[model samples]
Target: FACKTANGTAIPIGGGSANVYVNLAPVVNVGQNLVVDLSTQIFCHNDYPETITDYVTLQRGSAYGGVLSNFSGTVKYSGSSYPFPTTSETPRVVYNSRTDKPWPVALYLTPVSSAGGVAIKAGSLIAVLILRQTNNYNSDDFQFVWNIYANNDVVVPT
Candidate 1:
């Protein structure tokens, strides 16, 4: 039900009661790489209904400390035995003149394996992202964020 570090530490989110944002600026060090499991659920709630597909959008803010050079990601089943499935990024919006993509990327998981969604289980992993932070600390006004969409609606970060 929350985002976690690759090793399983819970990453806090804010929005008060809404819990809509992934607050990473403080937990991650200025020069460290953030390894996040975009979807990590401990409970087996099939909120997604059936096995259809999911879309995940990753966005970065103007005040974000992580830059474009160190970001990398992929789509895979959360379990260790499932083979790594490949997906492509939608063309990214360009910022800072030369940088692009990973900052504002959309990934879709459908047809890659099957077509219906079932068993929204714990051993199932939705997606993953690895982003590196800028050596210089940036103002904490904004931070790197990740949100997921199921069916057509956002999972709402709750």
Candidate 2:
């Protein structure tokens, strides 16, 4: 489990404040199935609207990159002038090997946004789990986990 502040500022916990926080769990081995959990929070401040977008991808190895799934959501500030409280964001991911190919051993996450630069009063967290196998599903077998935050705060860098 790991957490980081994207803007290097402490996440606001009061009202009318916008903050973004994320959390992801490590890959867990459960027989032939691999599972991982994800969480994110986008707090709103000063009536400014906020949104949290998440992306998940699976890769075979250093030679090829594949996309598995992607998801995003918008968070807005409502009510009176009172600051926004700490909002909770949650999401989960599970992969089942239905095809002849082996399940993805490596996973990555990234936040998507083109406005406000992810704000200042925000934080993010992510956790990952890896399932172990006795043999590679194919010749391109490679294992790695990565986390990407806005503003280039942190990334696994492949």
Maximum-lDDT candidate: 1
User: Once model 2 is optimally superposed onto the true structure by TM-score, how far is the C-alpha of residue 53 displaced, in angstroms?
Assistant: 31
For residue 130, model 2's alpha carbon misses the true position, in angstroms, by: 7.4
Could you give the C-alpha RMSD of every candidate to the true structure, in order shown? 18.9, 21.8
Q: Note the clash tally of each candidate.
A: 5, 25
lDDT of each: 0.24, 0.22
lDDT of 1 by residue, 1-158 (tens): 12333233333322111112232222222233333333432111111224322222222211111112222223333222112223332222212221111232222221212212231222222333322122112222222333221222111111
